[PDB]
Amino acid sequence: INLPITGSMDTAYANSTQEETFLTSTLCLYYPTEAATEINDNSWKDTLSQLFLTKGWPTGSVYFKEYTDIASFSVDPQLYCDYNVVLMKYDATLQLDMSELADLILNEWLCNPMDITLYYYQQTDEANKWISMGSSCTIKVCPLNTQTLGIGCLTTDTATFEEVATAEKLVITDVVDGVNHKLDVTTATCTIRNCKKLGPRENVAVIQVGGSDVLDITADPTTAPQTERMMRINWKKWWQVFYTVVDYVNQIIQAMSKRSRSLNSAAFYYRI
Amino acid sequence: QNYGINLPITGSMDTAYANSTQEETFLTSTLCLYYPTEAATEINDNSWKDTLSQLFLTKGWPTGSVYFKEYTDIASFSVDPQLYCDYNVVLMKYDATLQLDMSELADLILNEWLCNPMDITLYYYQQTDEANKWISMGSSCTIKVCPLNTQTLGIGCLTTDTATFEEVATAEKLVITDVVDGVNHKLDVTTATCTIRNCKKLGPRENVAVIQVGGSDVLDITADPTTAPQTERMMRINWKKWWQVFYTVVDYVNQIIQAMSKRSR
Amino acid sequence: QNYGINLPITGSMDTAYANSTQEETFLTSTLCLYYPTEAATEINDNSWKDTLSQLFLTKGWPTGSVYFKEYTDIASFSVDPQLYCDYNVVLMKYDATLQLDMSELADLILNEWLCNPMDITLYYYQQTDEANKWISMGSSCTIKVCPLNTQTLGIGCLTTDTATFEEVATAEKLVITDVVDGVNHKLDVTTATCTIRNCKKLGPRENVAVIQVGGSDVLDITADPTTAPQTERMMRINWKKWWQVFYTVVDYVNQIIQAMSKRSR
Amino acid sequence: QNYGINLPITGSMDTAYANSTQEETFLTSTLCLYYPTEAATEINDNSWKDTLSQLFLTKGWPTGSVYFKEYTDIASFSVDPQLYCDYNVVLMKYDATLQLDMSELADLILNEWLCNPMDITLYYYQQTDEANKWISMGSSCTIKVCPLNTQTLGIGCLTTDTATFEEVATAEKLVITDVVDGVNHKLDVTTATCTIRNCKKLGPRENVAVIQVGGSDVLDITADPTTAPQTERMMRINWKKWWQVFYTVVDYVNQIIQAMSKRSR
Amino acid sequence: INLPITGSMDTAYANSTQEETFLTSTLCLYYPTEAATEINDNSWKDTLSQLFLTKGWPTGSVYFKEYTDIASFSVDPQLYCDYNVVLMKYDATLQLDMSELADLILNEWLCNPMDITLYYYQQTDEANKWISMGSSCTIKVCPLNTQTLGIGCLTTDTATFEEVATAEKLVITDVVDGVNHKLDVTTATCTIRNCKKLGPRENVAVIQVGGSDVLDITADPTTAPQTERMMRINWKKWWQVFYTVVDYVNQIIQAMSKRSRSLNSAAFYYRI
Amino acid sequence: LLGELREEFNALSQEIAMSQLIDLALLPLDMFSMFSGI
Ligand SMILES: *[C@@H]1O[C@H](CO)[C@@H](O)[C@H](O)[C@H]1NC(C)=O
Ligand SMILES: *[C@@H]1O[C@H](CO)[C@@H](O)[C@H](O)[C@H]1NC(C)=O
Ligand SMILES: *[C@@H]1O[C@H](CO)[C@@H](O)[C@H](O)[C@H]1NC(C)=O
Ligand SMILES: *[C@@H]1O[C@H](CO)[C@@H](O)[C@H](O)[C@H]1NC(C)=O
Ligand SMILES: *[C@@H]1O[C@H](CO)[C@@H](O)[C@H](O)[C@H]1NC(C)=O
Ligand SMILES: [Ca+2]
Ligand SMILES: [Ca+2]
Ligand SMILES: [Ca+2]
Ligand SMILES: [Ca+2]
Ligand SMILES: [Ca+2]
Ligand SMILES: [Ca+2]
Ligand SMILES: [Ca+2]
Ligand SMILES: [Ca+2]
Ligand SMILES: [Ca+2]
Ligand SMILES: [Ca+2]
Ligand SMILES: [Ca+2]
Ligand SMILES: [Ca+2]
Ligand SMILES: [Ca+2]
Ligand SMILES: [Ca+2]
Ligand SMILES: [Ca+2]
């Protein structure tokens, strides 16, 4: 709504919305199969629910959704909850994969599809990128000139293109903004969409269960920001991790904030 | 440009009616038809899509704004319908054996749902108001419910003997379940094949327009058996062919876009 | 001279800064470094202690005020650390496989704890606020906990079958356990080898300074995962020789002693 | 047009913003990238330099202003790094076994050093302030140091027996040595293979920009362990290829050049 | 600093900066192998050190630098000292070499590189010359007329060029300022750079140990100046020369002044 | 390949003077006069 807001400074602080946002909201943890395996129990979910019930979160409000691995989760994350917590392990090989996962879930995207064989697309601003998901996306790019001819590449020979992605389940390609590129992609396995980044998704919350903070949300190498809903833990077990989560969940939900844009079950808005 | 707030609006009655937005929204928006494989079968033409696009060109819509998206059957379309366009039209055939299925499809796509997940195994859920329902999708769903009493025991069903439960669905691709609102229910569902979500019904989705190409109007969008409404974007047609239907749609698309309004969310 | 009492104290803003306590605190205080066996092994000298003391002498610290106290390993040091010196420094090696151990060591020494005993067999303990934790020292601690409901029954475990308990520690020399705050836990520990105390966290210990000789800063002092702070007495260095490390420490000892502040108790 | 003089500058707060220097400073300046051999190896192309130059052409940097200067390894680049350009970008791979080498490199290039020569055989030197150090370059430097008392006698080392000296480096292609500032040291170096220079750290060279392509930020520029700062021109990327890295550098070169400022010396 | 300076004439002269500039500066002698040869000693450096220690220059301030040949020194001199002195033997067969060396180190140069094959260079003013360094620089040049054709030469035939140098280690080429010259140079063994001359270098002091003054710093045969940091000695030995230098070092440092432009270790600034 | 052209225009905006600009804004700078100094 484009209309303006007004207020004052004599008004008083109203009562606490905590202990009611729990009653009228839902929470959803996303943990790894490694945790369930280390635990080797069946009623740990009911245990965590009966624990949450003391902190206020009622029985039918908490949810646990397993994901086999970081990349498997990155492939089409179907986050549909009023509060999402994600626990993600550290791996120097999956550093970029779990930075792209962050860039995807933390932020809200407006995605338009792409027709590669029939058209050739470009980028406009510093927030219009190309996100490709699927089993294995092997993307190659050849920039072109004003008269539709290759620059350091051959428009026919795919082996002369510049391979930016080699066998990656989730790729977020940023290229030079202003020039037309031609793309070679494994359309039979992966789908690639030109997505503009909107404001942040305040509904999710990442927790790096392992090493130091490495996630670089903003693709420019000058900011390197550390947002509110990006926590870090050191671990040797998972029960201690879940107990820490439960004991400090009110802070997590105080650092999160229900969305404003719209209701949607996808991790990105689709508007053709 | 405030978001996530509701502010009072103002106006007047002296302002003049501005020029028409048709022939500008037709360019700055997108259109998406959904047709049945029976139509393409009866047609047997590989250029009907470009033909209809060139016909839309006369009515205003440019060439790269219209899309045709096939679907084999009403149920195979009801299974996870991911509608993402700016103006959606759906064609639907009449089949008394699919009355309730293609009424659930209508109640699903026409309306806008706020959907949270469900954990059958652990929790026993209940419906608060008349607009909280449980919608299940998948290849083949088999749902069985058991209400509970005040003391967490069954009422005509046993919390262990699943067979005692009451069967509301039998091998359905889409189900919309409304149960007595105010009692805790236990569920049994083959969750391997189907996913069930607890949804709340909100204001209608003004982006989609259903067109029943066949018999009389049976679609009861609202689950209460008192309204039985017929909305603006809920159309009916009599048919013996499909080229005539598509020509009708093309000639009366402006009426369709006048009966539809872009989303609010 | 009223001890044990806290009374309001006053001041002003017209006064002028007094002389430098530095160059006198060195003489009137004591220093105590904690280096690893690896360091003296790389050095392979029998007079490096007196060498560093003669060097310190140039910075002001007299001969019999500085002390060196070796430690075989990080866990063997964490097991009952007795830091009784008016200025303590610790050199800590980085290891990915020891991250939680060398973060618990930090949270245990950098902060001042008020610890009460704990009789597992006889009582059932809980936590009150976000600073009441359970600190377990010893050679090999294997801790298991079962949370309980209102009526002293189990929750996902059985109070008689120890195997049903939840394993939070597995053969660790130091653990700092935080559990949900407001529920009773029934514990099982190998109390022959490990002692567990119910400790509350007070304001920080400003008398000890940690120096991470290796990789990036990882020490999460705060049990709450949101903050992840980095205080003034948690320093970091990159190293290839321990002589270079010790020369750095000696050359910048004054900044360290400025980042540290004697105890109030 | 006074040179080597410093005088009071004056101004006001009503001035209009004069110009907008980007797209002119680019034309009238020169940029120089320093990439590793790993990148060209992964690329396997003989025209990628011209390609990147044509790309920069869009950003405004013309053809004969962008330069590339390969380097085999961090050590080979640290050996006498002759950075002579109006803007310098450096790509730097992460390796836990090279943290100190690639921190010394950062401390050397990022900062502007005033370096006098050193003659070890005759003279015994001492560091005056905290910004005075001894930087040794060459194929392989091996440094040993004996601090000395007031009567030019060793402390833990024998002036005649070099083996008694304390080793601070072992076949390093670049060392930056900081020792106790205020005592005279007798040195031993492989002078026939490597040269040591007594340097003083002035303010920072705003002409270079380091970009760690891999791991977390570890570069401890400041020798003292208390600050461990991180400037504007100390960047970090996560990578799995190099074409994406170069495209990112290109697309965000303007930010890099806003982070860099032409030299004052 | 474009801003101006103001002063007066009533102020009193301040105390002598001598006896402190020694402590806060360093001095570096450059001496030929002939000197160490005729000396035939190994402690002459410590002797001169302890002599400077009486003259007021402290122990860790003095440095010496053997240079095998005048040309070997001319090949990339690396001067980084707050005071530099250079003892230069006389040789009529090296007049132009040790005049070019003089013009190079006594003054301050701002240098850009030169790509002879990709470009054709020229001069702008009478101070924009081409200094070539290396082990054997054989240079040839063709001036081009108004219509990019050769004058007494051919753009294709290198034999027709005019050979300005012949197997030299340092050449300072000045040509007609305002015409485009094509070049041919032993780019493998020598690098040639287009340098503009700037305000002088008051940090060095040349001392010709032999015959009468010949050094023509100024490349035009109209000035023939003689500066203050260009000294001359008559010699039959070297120990007497070094004793002279020691006894009259204060005069040399009065004749010299620390640089003003910036810090650097070479005989010239590099600005691409 | 405007992203940089606009910035060049906004750098050249105020450097231009006012008196001479008003002196030049009264001239019929027809096609020849407008494309001659280019
Ligand atoms: C807000 O809190 C105060 C203090 O607990 C209480 O008196 C008041 O009733 C609360 N507000 C409402 C609307 O109940
Ligand atoms: C709408 O129609 C009127 C009447 O022809 C015309 O004056 C007006 O410009 C039109 N609106 C627009 C936006 O062109
Ligand atoms: C404190 O410092 C001042 C200034 O340096 C000095 O005059 C005074 O003597 C010092 N105080 C003492 C007790 O020495
Ligand atoms: C300058 O020299 C005079 C005479 O030797 C002496 O009296 C004076 O103290 C000196 N100046 C200073 C600042 O010491
Ligand atoms: C900015 O413009 C003024 C005149 O408009 C000019 O004198 C000045 O040199 C310009 N700034 C730069 C950095 O060239
Ligand atoms: Ca990836
Ligand atoms: Ca190529
Ligand atoms: Ca981009
Ligand atoms: Ca159905
Ligand atoms: Ca029954
Ligand atoms: Ca109901
Ligand atoms: Ca531990
Ligand atoms: Ca707690
Ligand atoms: Ca259990
Ligand atoms: Ca090194
Ligand atoms: Ca020794
Ligand atoms: Ca030092
Ligand atoms: Ca010569
Ligand atoms: Ca000729
Ligand atoms: Ca000339």
mmCIF file of N, CA and C in Angstrom, chain A residues 41-53 59 62 64 239, chain B residues 119 121-124, chain C residues 147 155-156:
data_model
loop_
_atom_site.group_PDB
_atom_site.id
_atom_site.type_symbol
_atom_site.label_atom_id
_atom_site.label_comp_id
_atom_site.label_asym_id
_atom_site.label_seq_id
_atom_site.Cartn_x
_atom_site.Cartn_y
_atom_site.Cartn_z
ATOM 1 N N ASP A 41 16.786 -43.188 17.693
ATOM 2 C CA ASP A 41 15.566 -43.232 18.485
ATOM 3 C C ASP A 41 14.391 -42.947 17.562
ATOM 4 N N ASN A 42 13.181 -43.176 18.081
ATOM 5 C CA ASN A 42 11.943 -43.036 17.323
ATOM 6 C C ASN A 42 11.012 -41.960 17.856
ATOM 7 N N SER A 43 11.011 -41.706 19.167
ATOM 8 C CA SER A 43 10.135 -40.722 19.794
ATOM 9 C C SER A 43 10.873 -39.445 20.184
ATOM 10 N N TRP A 44 12.012 -39.158 19.549
ATOM 11 C CA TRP A 44 12.714 -37.912 19.838
ATOM 12 C C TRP A 44 11.915 -36.702 19.373
ATOM 13 N N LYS A 45 11.081 -36.869 18.347
ATOM 14 C CA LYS A 45 10.232 -35.771 17.901
ATOM 15 C C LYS A 45 9.163 -35.460 18.940
ATOM 16 N N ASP A 46 8.497 -36.497 19.454
ATOM 17 C CA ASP A 46 7.531 -36.302 20.531
ATOM 18 C C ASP A 46 8.201 -35.718 21.769
ATOM 19 N N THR A 47 9.437 -36.140 22.051
ATOM 20 C CA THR A 47 10.197 -35.559 23.156
ATOM 21 C C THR A 47 10.386 -34.058 22.964
ATOM 22 N N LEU A 48 10.865 -33.654 21.785
ATOM 23 C CA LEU A 48 11.067 -32.234 21.519
ATOM 24 C C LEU A 48 9.754 -31.465 21.555
ATOM 25 N N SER A 49 8.653 -32.093 21.141
ATOM 26 C CA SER A 49 7.361 -31.413 21.182
ATOM 27 C C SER A 49 6.901 -31.202 22.620
ATOM 28 N N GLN A 50 7.018 -32.238 23.455
ATOM 29 C CA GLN A 50 6.689 -32.105 24.870
ATOM 30 C C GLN A 50 7.630 -31.153 25.598
ATOM 31 N N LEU A 51 8.823 -30.907 25.052
ATOM 32 C CA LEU A 51 9.711 -29.900 25.624
ATOM 33 C C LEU A 51 9.268 -28.497 25.225
ATOM 34 N N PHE A 52 9.124 -28.257 23.919
ATOM 35 C CA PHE A 52 8.513 -27.051 23.362
ATOM 36 C C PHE A 52 7.239 -26.625 24.086
ATOM 37 N N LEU A 53 6.396 -27.598 24.454
ATOM 38 C CA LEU A 53 5.158 -27.311 25.178
ATOM 39 C C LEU A 53 5.380 -26.569 26.496
ATOM 40 N N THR A 59 1.417 -28.526 21.021
ATOM 41 C CA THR A 59 1.720 -29.822 20.420
ATOM 42 C C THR A 59 1.727 -29.748 18.896
ATOM 43 N N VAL A 62 4.850 -27.570 16.162
ATOM 44 C CA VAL A 62 6.229 -27.884 15.813
ATOM 45 C C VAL A 62 6.229 -28.978 14.758
ATOM 46 N N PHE A 64 9.150 -31.369 12.184
ATOM 47 C CA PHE A 64 10.502 -31.787 11.835
ATOM 48 C C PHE A 64 10.466 -32.397 10.444
ATOM 49 N N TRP A 239 22.028 -34.092 20.200
ATOM 50 C CA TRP A 239 21.088 -33.848 21.290
ATOM 51 C C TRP A 239 21.362 -32.511 21.967
ATOM 52 N N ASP B 119 1.739 -33.612 10.688
ATOM 53 C CA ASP B 119 2.502 -34.764 11.169
ATOM 54 C C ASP B 119 1.488 -35.727 11.783
ATOM 55 N N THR B 121 1.717 -38.958 12.364
ATOM 56 C CA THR B 121 2.288 -39.927 13.302
ATOM 57 C C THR B 121 2.239 -39.451 14.752
ATOM 58 N N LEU B 122 2.599 -38.193 14.997
ATOM 59 C CA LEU B 122 2.755 -37.684 16.356
ATOM 60 C C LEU B 122 1.481 -37.038 16.889
ATOM 61 N N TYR B 123 0.949 -36.063 16.164
ATOM 62 C CA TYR B 123 -0.083 -35.169 16.666
ATOM 63 C C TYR B 123 -1.472 -35.629 16.244
ATOM 64 N N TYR B 124 -2.463 -35.177 17.010
ATOM 65 C CA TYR B 124 -3.877 -35.370 16.713
ATOM 66 C C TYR B 124 -4.499 -33.989 16.588
ATOM 67 N N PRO C 147 14.636 -36.412 30.221
ATOM 68 C CA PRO C 147 13.723 -35.414 30.789
ATOM 69 C C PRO C 147 12.437 -36.059 31.277
ATOM 70 N N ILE C 155 9.952 -39.089 29.382
ATOM 71 C CA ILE C 155 9.557 -38.472 28.118
ATOM 72 C C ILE C 155 10.547 -38.987 27.082
ATOM 73 N N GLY C 156 10.118 -39.950 26.273
ATOM 74 C CA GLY C 156 11.010 -40.574 25.317
ATOM 75 C C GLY C 156 12.115 -41.374 25.965
#
